[PDB]
Amino acid sequence: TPDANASISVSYKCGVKDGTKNTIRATINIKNTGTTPVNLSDIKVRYWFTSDGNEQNNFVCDYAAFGTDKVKGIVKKIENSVPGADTYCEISFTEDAGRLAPGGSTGTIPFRIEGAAEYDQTDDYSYNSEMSDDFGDNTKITAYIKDKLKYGVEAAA
Amino acid sequence: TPDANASISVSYKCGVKDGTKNTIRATINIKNTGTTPVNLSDIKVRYWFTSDGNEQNNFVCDYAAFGTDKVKGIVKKIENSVPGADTYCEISFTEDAGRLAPGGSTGTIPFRIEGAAEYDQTDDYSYNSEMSDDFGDNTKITAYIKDKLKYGVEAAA
Ligand SMILES: [Ca+2]
Ligand SMILES: [Ca+2]
Structure with missing residues (x-):
């Protein structure tokens, strides 16, 4: 089907941490790997983690080529937690965010999750400190087109 | 210098030809390979060719994620022709075309040159029929940031 054929990939770079240690920093880059355009409004990305007691976990996007105001995030609890995840952050895009041509990509989208x-972070499913120096294929981050899994493997028991 | 550090690359796919044989078809994909954003308005791309007697050679862009109305082309004669080129098509972008984040790209931008x-096309510097099935690194297409060469090798005696 046309929807079956749409494809995206995500690349990831692990950000920095200091001393307060209450900020998860990462950058993603979403690519259209298919042969037809994709609307950013149809794309979602999930970052899976353990919140380590934090009830409040706040998402912020710090840069996007098309504007930070196009990027949305919600952080939700997982009822039946799994290895590396009692929470996920779901990143999405506004209706007016734009579209990815075949072979196109967003480039860097840095964000923070603040507690x-x-x-x-070592006990977070989606954390991969091996990908700090260069963008990599972090398949523990998932992405979706119209709520259908297109990239990565979901955290699961 | 900051300008020195900006970087882009271009990938290319050779289009189709038929029977009238009066249309050059190609697709390009421009990527920001640097660590700071690039404005599309600062980018130019040149496709170098022999016009085979055609005095009139018309550029058309058929698709772009950000709109065909953002893409401009002019075709100019080369006074002191060189191997594979007595003409070039210079592709550029409007002030409002947008920007490429680090690691971002345009995705497919198909165009035609009509005579x-x-x-x-076999005697055109920028033509590479080996890159018909997949996008490739066609370094006989040049690209520029603020009129400074950033990708490829110019056709030259
Ligand atoms: Ca944790
Ligand atoms: Ca020719």
């Missing part, structure tokens, strides 16, 4: 208390 | 009489 009051410290995050230990 | 009244037949083109023989």
Whole structure:
């Protein structure tokens, strides 16, 4: 089917951490790997993690070529937690965000997930410190077109 | 310098030809390979060719994610022709075309160069029929940021 044929990939770079240790930093780059355009409004990305007691976990996008105001994020609890995830951050795009041509991509989209208390990122499904120096194929980040899985493997028991 | 550090690459796919043989078809995909954004308005691309007697050679862009109305082309004669080129088509972008984030790209930008009489593309510097099945690194197409060469090798005696 036409929807079956749409394809995207995501690349990832692990950000920096300091001393307060209450900020998850990462950058993603979403590519249209198919032969027809994709609307950004149809794309969602999930970052799976353990919130380490933080009830409040706030998403911020710090840059996007098409404007930070096009990028949305919600952080939700997982009821039946799984290895590396009791929470996920779901990144999405506004209706007016634009579209990716075949072979096109967003380029860097850096974001933060902010908590009051410290995050230990080592016990997060989507965290991969091996991808700090260069963008890599972090298949523990998932992406969706019209709510159908197109990239990565979901955290799961 | 900051300008020195900006970088782009271009990938290319050779289009189709038939029977009238008076249309050059190609697709390009421009990528920001640097670590700071690039404005599309600062980018130019040149396709170098022999016009085979055609005095009139018309550029058309058939698709772009950001709109065909953002893409401009002019075809100019080369006074002191060189191997594979007595003409070039210079593709550029409007002030409002948008920008490429680091790691971003345009995706497919198909275009045509239209002539009244037949083109023989085999004697064109920028033509590479080996890149018909997949996008490739056609370094006989040049690209520029603020009129400074950033990709490819210009046709030259
Ligand atoms: Ca954690
Ligand atoms: Ca020719």
